[PDB]
């Protein structure tokens, strides 16, 4: 049985890394006050 032809590489460029890390850290900054309550 052949290997699966539907597989694909996945990518995240550096700029998307910086964008996503900013998103997560600012979201944590906003909700943390509410988690500690």
């Amino acid at each position: 049985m052949e290997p699966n032809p539907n597989r694909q590489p996945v990518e995240l460029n550096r700029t998307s890394l910086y964008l996503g890390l900013l998103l997560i850290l600012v979201l944590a900054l906003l909700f943390s006050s509410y988690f500690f309550n």
């Binding site: 990518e11 995240l12 850290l25 979201l27 944590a28 500690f36």
Partner: protein
């Protein structure tokens, strides 16, 4: 202050889990090219 004690673990995982996810994806992108 008398804050909810699980707030710390909530906040730590809230940061760590999705950040690690992004870092995993970025580094394996770089070792491709």
């Amino acid at each position: 202050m008398e804050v909810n004690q699980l707030g710390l673990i909530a906040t730590a995982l809230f940061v760590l889990v999705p950040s690690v996810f992004l870092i995993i994806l970025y580094v394996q992108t770089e070792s491709q090219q």
